[PDB]
Design a protein around this ligand. Structure first.
Ligand SMILES: NC(=O)[C@H](Cc1c[nH]c2ccccc12)NC(=O)[C@H](CCCc1ccccc1)CP(=O)(O)[C@@H](Cc1ccccc1)NC(=O)OCc1ccccc1
Ligand SMILES: C[C@H](CCC(=O)NCCC[N+](C)(C)CCCS(=O)(=O)[O-])[C@H]1CC[C@H]2[C@@H]3[C@H](O)C[C@@H]4C[C@H](O)CC[C@]4(C)[C@H]3C[C@H](O)[C@]12C
Ligand SMILES: C[C@H](CCC(=O)NCCC[N+](C)(C)CCCS(=O)(=O)[O-])[C@H]1CC[C@H]2[C@@H]3[C@H](O)C[C@@H]4C[C@H](O)CC[C@]4(C)[C@H]3C[C@H](O)[C@]12C
Ligand SMILES: [Ca+2]
Ligand SMILES: [Zn+2]
Ligand SMILES: [Zn+2]
Length: 162
C-alpha cells in the first residue's frame, strides 16, 4: 500500500534496525520482543515493519547510557527508561532504551522491555500521553500483561490515522 498522508502519497512498509542490545537478555528474545511491540501497532494501522541489519532505517533503535550524543542524557537505573525523538538531520525515528535498567520480559519484578518498547513505538508513530492509567501511552510504567491496546489507545490511533 501507499497511503495519502499530509497531502502526500507515503509508503507504509517500513524498516527498523536494532543497533545495540541490552546485556541481560539474549539477542533472539530482544528481537522477537521488538517485533511483537511493533506488531501491536501494525495490527491497527496500514504500516508494516521489516528488520534490517545495516545502514539507516526508518526506525533506529539503540540501548545507551547517560550521554550518547543527543541532548537527552539517560539517568542510570530507574527514572527514564527510554525515549524516542525525530532527529532533524536524518529522516528517521530514533528510539533509545536506557542500558542501565534491569531489562526483563514477562517478569513483574524487572523493567519490561515489551511494554517500554510498545510505548516508544507509540511515540514514533505520533501518539502522545494520556491520563488513562492502564493505557500503553501512559507517562508512567507499571508491569501490565498481556500487552494490549486500551480503548484510549485505539481512539488515539484512530485520531491520528483513519
Ligand atoms: N519510570 C517511568 O514510568 C518514567 C517516568 C518517571 C517515574 N518516576 C520518575 C523519576 C525520575 C524521572 C522520570 C520518572 N517514564 C519513562 O521513563 C518513559 C518511557 C516509558 C513509559 C512506559 C513503559 C510501559 C508502559 C507505560 C509507560 C519516558 P518517555 O516518556 O518516553 C520520554 C518522552 C520524551 C521523548 C523525547 C523528548 C522529551 C521527552 N520522557 C521524558 O520525560 O524524557 C526527558 C524529559 C524530562 C522532564 C520533562 C520533559 C522531557
Ligand atoms: C505512512 C504514515 C501515514 C499514513 C506516516 C505517519 C507518521 C510517519 C512516521 C513518523 O513521522 C516518524 C518517522 C519520521 C521519519 O522522517 C520517517 C520514518 C517515520 C517512522 C515516519 C514514517 C511514515 O511516514 C509515517 C508512519
Ligand atoms: C518525567 C515526567 C514524570 C516524572 C513526565 C510527567 C508528564 C510527562 C509529560 C506530559 O505528558 C506532556 C507531554 C506528552 C508528550 O507525549 C511527551 C512530552 C510531554 C511534556 C511529557 C513528558 C514527560 O514524560 C513527563 C513530564
Ligand atoms: Ca534510567
Ligand atoms: Zn537518546
Ligand atoms: Zn512517553
Amino acid at each position: 500500500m501507499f497511503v495519502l498522508s499530509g497531502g502526500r502519497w507515503e509508503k507504509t512498509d517500513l524498516t527498523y534496525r536494532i543497533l545495540r542490545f541490552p546485556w541481560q537478555l539474549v539477542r533472539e528474545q530482544v528481537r522477537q520482543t521488538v517485533a511483537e511491540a511493533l506488531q501491536v501497532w501494525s495490527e491497527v494501522t496500514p504500516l508494516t515493519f521489516t528488520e534490517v541489519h545495516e545502514g539507516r532505517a526508518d526506525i533506529m533503535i539503540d540501548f545507551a547510557r547517560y550521554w550518547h550524543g543527543d541532548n537527552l542524557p539517560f539517568d542510570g537505573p530507574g527514572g527514564i527508561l527510554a525515549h524516542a525523538f525525530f532527529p532533524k538531520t536524518h529522516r528517521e525515528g530514533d528510539v533509545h532504551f536506557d542500558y542501565d535498567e534491569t531489562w526483563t520480559i514477562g517478569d513483574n519484578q524487572g523493567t519490561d522491555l515489551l511494554q517500554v518498547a510498545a510505548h516508544e513505538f507509540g511515540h514514533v508513530l505520533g501518539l502522545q500521553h494520556t491520563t488513562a492509567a492502564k493505557a500503553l501511552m501512559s507517562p508512567f510504567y507499571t508491569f501490565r500483561y498481556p500487552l494490549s491496546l486500551s480503548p484510549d489507545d485505539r481512539r488515539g490511533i484512530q485520531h491520528l490515522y483513519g
